[PDB]
């Protein structure tokens, strides 16, 4: 019974002490100098941290076929001009919506078969002249391979379209602009679930949803044209994915094309340019391959950073330290 | 807002992401089925006490 | 237990004085740089 | 006699020993309830930590998710929570329930 | 560049753009009848 | 991408395209029951449907 | 040419192999290059 | 206007829309494809 009382004393003292510590932390970190110092200390820890040695949904057939199709696009899209790329993307999106609309045609174009000649003949007879030669070649390559499910087919086509647009963005040299715009649109779509839900409903006609997107946040004066086109094309062909998740996938793919990895860094406040460069360098060193850092701002962190790449998270948030202290009591 | 709507009728109720009631009383929660659905006229608004 | 309860009520008041030091040290630890407060 | 010296020391040592160093960690998300997406390297029968100190065990593993059996206070589990992997395979956990104290 | 109110203009404009008696069709189960009193998002038992 | 009713003819052509022998492919096989994709002309191979034929190693060629 | 564990349901283990390397009866061929064989981690290499 | 066999389990026959003599999608519950 004595030790029972002692334990009650321990829990009470710990709870009050940790509450006082939390108040002290909150008071001390309100100063922006405190925020910057916390971020700098966490970055130091990050340099001290050891490096990490280490389209998933696609199965074997779909994944291999998509690899073949992306290789084919890389081959064909070598010297195509920017206007040609805008075209090619347009025809690819049109064909994707065609396949989606014509369920029977997609079905017949889906089943794997040892001989690809009948499928190629079918495509040529269908749209030999309705689209340019490069589109014909890409679609022929896409149908030649096998797909685990018919859906993957259209996915592959859609992928190519996105790639094409990204390519012209690269030709424009504004890859950074389009990536930033795509991430911002993903943020606002996630923040406004109603807009995503109204856009993420294929049942309604696609033209109306595209017009809604254009008028709401995509026809704005200060929006990169390539990003707007990519987002409108994505929503137009949308199959049932959440619009915000679709935009996040677009941004992730855009960064992937540059060979980098997206790192979602959550901070209490915005970071300095020097801090941003240091963070990018340390994250690249830890993960090896270069990483592009996207800043979320959340006051509840109280300081530090909460980085996350892939399925891995480095939680330096001060609030996390406070929670650990709360749960670490005897 | 943050009010769900009946989807299937045991009644399945679909809530906005980030507003799913905890495993709660609703007015027109047994399981979280994912995609912000929970299991407890289709489309009637549903509110959570919290 | 009444003697024990009285001891508990006395010691909790006695130790309330030192909570400032413990909380300050804990904040010092979970900030990396010591906080004087 | 309950000397306040030990009363304060039992917390002073903990405070002086608290060091929650940021550890590069692999997480997942509760998709329904619990099934957890992510945790690619989770072992079969691995111990998982859900928010609020809840504990689960990973039994069913597949390409989509991980089925985890919660070891108590399942009512605290919500879709979208973050699940951490402990990396390792009296109540059955060894925690005393009588209340007589701790165990070595 | 984001107002968060022009979004409202667009969304309610579209909702108004949607706006007759509702008629269901037999699929094998009746599709449609969104306001009908075994009900699920696909069809009606 | 205007698509007239040519599709309906085209599919028919495709449907007719598939003198050469009809070779199926085992798609799965367990518990003594195999499923064969292909063999569009196979006679009633217990269960037949638009996907496969319910009659060994996956990928084997199956004679009609 | 070596498979990788895809599902672990107690004793049952679904393993995925490359296209032309599926082992022979491995208690069952689930199709799509998977087989159902009778502290494991998804993705660990499996050798035929 | 003539149906065709799709599954032979019981036989399922697909018919042109509006010509269904009922599993939906115009199906109604020997070589697959023979016209009915």
Residue numbers in the entry:
A (entry chain d): 109 to 162, 169 to 444
B (entry chain D): 7 to 15, 19 to 32, 34 to 38, 53 to 64, 74 to 83
C (entry chain b): 130 to 166
D (entry chain A): 5 to 37, 42 to 97, 111 to 125
E (entry chain C): 5 to 23, 28 to 36, 43 to 51, 68 to 75
F (entry chain B): 5 to 22, 27 to 52, 66 to 76, 85 to 93
G (entry chain E): 8 to 32, 53 to 65, 72 to 81
H (entry chain F): 8 to 16, 19 to 30, 56 to 63, 73 to 79
Article excerpt on this structure:
The membrane domain of the mycobacterial ATP synthase is embedded in the IPM, with the catalytic F1-domain of the enzyme extending into the bacterial cytoplasm and attached to the membrane domain by a central stalk and a peripheral stalk (PS). As do other ATP synthases in eubacteria, chloroplasts, and mitochondria, the enzyme couples a proton-motive force (pmf) across the IPM generated by respiration to the synthesis in the F1-domain of the enzyme of ATP from adenosine diphosphate (ADP) and phosphate by a mechanical rotary mechanism. The mycobacterial rotor consists of a membrane-bound ring of nine c-subunits, attached to an elongated central stalk, made of single copies of the γ- and ε-subunits. The mycobacterial PS is made of two proteins, bδ and b′.
The PS is a key component of the enzyme’s stator joining the external surface of the α3β3-spherical component of the catalytic domain to the a-subunit in the membrane domain, thereby helping to ensure the maintenance of the contact between the membrane domains of the rotor and the stator during catalysis. In the structure of the M. smegmatis ATP synthase, the PS is a complex of a single b′-subunit (similar to b′-subunits in bacteria and chloroplasts) and the unique bδ-subunit. In the current structure, the bδ-subunit consists of 16 α-helices with a β-strand separating bδH14 and bδH15, with three additional β-strands between bδH15 and bδH16. Then, bδH4 to bδH8 form a separate domain, named the “linking domain,” which is attached to bδH9 in the third domain, named “the δ-domain,” consisting of bδH9 to bδH16. The δ-domain is similar to the canonical δ-subunits in other eubacteria. However, a feature not remarked on previously is that the bδH4 to bδH8 linking domain can be superimposed onto the δ-domain by a clockwise rotation of ca.120°. Therefore, the δ- and linking domains appear to have arisen by a process that involves a gene duplication event at some point during evolution. Thus, the bδ-subunit has two structurally related domains and each binds to the N-terminal region of an α-subunit (subunits α2 and α3) in a similar fashion with the third α-subunit attached by a different mode.
